[PDB]
Design a protein around this nucleic acid. Sequence first.
DNA 1: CTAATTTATGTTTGTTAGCGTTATACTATTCTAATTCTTTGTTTCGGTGGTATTGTTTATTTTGTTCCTTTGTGCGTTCAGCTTAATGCCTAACG
DNA 2: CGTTAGGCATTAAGCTGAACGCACAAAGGAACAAAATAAACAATACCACCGAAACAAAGAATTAGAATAGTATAACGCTAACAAACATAAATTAG
Lengths: 95, 95, 76, 97, 98, 84, 81, 106, 106
Amino acid sequence: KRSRKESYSVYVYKVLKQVHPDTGISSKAMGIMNSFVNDIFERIAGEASRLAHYNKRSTITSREIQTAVRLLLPGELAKHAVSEGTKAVTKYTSA
Amino acid sequence: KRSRKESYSVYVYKVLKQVHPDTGISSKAMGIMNSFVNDIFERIAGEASRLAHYNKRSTITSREIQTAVRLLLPGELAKHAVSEGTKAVTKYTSA
Amino acid sequence: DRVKRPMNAFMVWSRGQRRKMAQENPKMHNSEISKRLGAEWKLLSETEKRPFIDEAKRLRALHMKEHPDYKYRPRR
Amino acid sequence: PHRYRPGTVALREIRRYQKSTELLIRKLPFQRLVREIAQDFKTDLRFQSSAVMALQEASEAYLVGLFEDTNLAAIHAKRVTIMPKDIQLARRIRGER
Amino acid sequence: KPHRYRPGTVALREIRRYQKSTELLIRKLPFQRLVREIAQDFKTDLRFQSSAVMALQEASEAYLVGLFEDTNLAAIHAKRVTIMPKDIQLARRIRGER
Amino acid sequence: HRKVLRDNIQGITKPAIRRLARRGGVKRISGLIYEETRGVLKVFLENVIRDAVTYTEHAKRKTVTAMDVVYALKRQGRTLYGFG
Amino acid sequence: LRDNIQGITKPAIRRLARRGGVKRISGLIYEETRGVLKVFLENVIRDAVTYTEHAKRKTVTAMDVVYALKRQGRTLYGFGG
Amino acid sequence: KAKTRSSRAGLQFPVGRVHRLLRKGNYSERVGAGAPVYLAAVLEYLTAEILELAGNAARDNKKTRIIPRHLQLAIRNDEELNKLLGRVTIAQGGVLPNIQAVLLPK
Amino acid sequence: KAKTRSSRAGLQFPVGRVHRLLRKGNYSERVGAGAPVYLAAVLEYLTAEILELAGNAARDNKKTRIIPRHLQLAIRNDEELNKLLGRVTIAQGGVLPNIQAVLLPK
DNA sequence: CTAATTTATGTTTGTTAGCGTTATACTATTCTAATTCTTTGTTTCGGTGGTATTGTTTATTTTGTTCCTTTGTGCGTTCAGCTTAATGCCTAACG
DNA sequence: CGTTAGGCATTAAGCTGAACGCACAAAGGAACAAAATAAACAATACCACCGAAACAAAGAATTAGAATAGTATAACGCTAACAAACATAAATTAG
């Protein structure tokens, strides 16, 4: 009857069981993954916000997120993330 | 009938004529002062925004601006700016 | 052989004026003469410049006759 | 003949170029370099003249910052000169490698 | 006749075991006392959570370990191994600290 | 519960500085490193603690959480992972 | 008209180092400084290209270079905000 | 029968929570519907890249748990994750074990 | 008769424009009325501190104009303005003229 | 040189300080356990000074090489007003 | 906690005329730049040393841990009342 901490703790474990079924995880490493998810969310959403302001756009669409991903993430991570993202919106729009 | 560049060019000259009546200013130095005013405005408003988010405040009042001034500006600049600011709101509230 | 653009009223007017200033000012830098000619050129009237304008126009039409399919294509 | 001592002309140029605020990179070769590199990322990329002036000014600022750090690292190692290991160290300690 | 190691020989094993191990190398109670000593001068009578002093200790150890890495880079660059305080001041100066 | 503190910079000791140095890869440490490193630590703690104190004093609070220390290290550009 | 990293000439780097307060420059500095300037312009140009490509503009304005330099911690004053 | 937006994209991260954080995070007035799906995609791929290297580090160490020493090892050994997390330090992580070659004896 | 908000505080910077930039800058949903007055105050004091040192530099150089060499001199010579503008470089500004003492002859 | 952009007044509304309560982690105390900091006596090795060789930078002169500042014209790029479909936010309902 | 069906009001794609921006014609030494060279001073190789830091054993003195009680404090919920967004009429100002 405490209020609940809204966090990304379950979904990191879901991804971990998708990618590594045998190894477990600590609690403090789950907190580190929660802080990392929130840090990367702030970076990408801040770049998307300032890009929408620089172009005088009042709407953040997937183009701004794609450009911010190409801005922040270096190397092959950028194009891998863009391919994953476009796969996700094609999945979401095909359904 | 060109659209007009909204900038702080007149008020920097007003402050300059208040503080230094004899010396003139260039145009490119006026552009530098405009860029500096916009840079400091972004710094102070960004710290005020993230402070209002960290305290779950939906309203940025003068307290957040005062705390952000004490955060960014080092040395005696902080307390000088706070004294100037409180002088300004006491002037604005006395009238 | 690349085709050069037609000379404008100022370039034509400078070709002969530029030499006039060099003979009277043969030690003057081209960089400085180019500045005084521009200052003097801005003081000519349209009637006085008209002759220069029409000749450049004629050089442009005659240039177009020699090379009709010529197109100005600047390098970006 | 009376040639100057090695470095005295360098000192006069130090004081002259530090008293000067001019741009030390010619505009046409920097324009050629910028439009030579930027084709590799996208083709048909014209530049405004203010943009290449800004790139030249910022590269000037970044290189004089790199060179004052380089001379700090070189003086630290008891050397008047600059060797490329000083540039390597000044880029490494700044966290750019 | 007891057996003695050489200077530097034990030092490499200590470097290896401290780079492998992930614990904190300064004790929690002097860090609590120093943090409460410093934070008097900004506002007296502050309560420090144990997690706050631990977070300050983590970031403190991280900052000093990075500064000592840069100090070793600068001392190696000047053809030394014994680092010196001028290396610390130099590595702070290049970094944008002062 | 009233108390004033003094001379706590000697509590971070010299064979506890040597371990922080030998984590970073240092093979030999001079004698005069210790007071300079204590001063570096002092000015770093003074900056981050002053930022945390302004953070907790804006919120009308009396204690220092770890979240405000994390925000104070974020404002200096040294982000800490592991506390929320 | 190719190989334009030799457009940044050797006297125009000696002037850049004399502004920085350097008394002597060895001969091996010019190629290293050319590579440093090359990778710096590669970063800033790639960011400005992504900026002007997001806005579907074929040219690179000055504001895009300001915004590309702001994100690396080196803000330009003077070219507008 | 209706299916969740997290598995509409075929993902694990919740689209609704990242949508709510984009709304109440105050980044714009409006936000597009492709934005949280794209952001959950790049987020899920990013922690997949972290956890795969972390699991390979922990299995390489003959351990069965992910302690943050494994996260620090997986981040510092990489090249293009080291540029993403260069300024960030890791709690209880330690350093990447590497000793300069001139300190070592011959 | 009504008097402007910029001179209600007795200032030069417009309170209405900084209020409008705080609104459309998307920093919060609401903004307090003391916020633009405080922000215009600290802004006006800040450019007053810049322009006073710039005028003293230009009068010290026996010039009558403020060129950005004077702004770069006034910013780099200061201590607590150098911490505010340490990362920012200045267009057509040059450097602060200072030469290391070991390069100089005896 | 007159449109436009800040300022004032009343209304709604939604945010926030005041208040109460309580839980909850913080601070202090006193014991043992352990562990590690500081002293003191080896010991050995790296920073620093001093000298000599060398290697390479600088300053200069000669000879190319370019540049620079001026206006009009051509062409490609961007931008702003107007059209118009796209879409995301709000509400009600459901799970 | 998370998702889904219909308005509606805001917003980005579409389109065209218009205005901007840039290259380039001649000029013709000026200003710059590459190249060859004398040599002079700086980097560096090597050597001695000496005092400074590492290593070790002992004990001291400090921290760790734990039970526990008080206890300031912080984090929950009602409530007013206050302050800020919003709709609509001047004015001054300024590019």
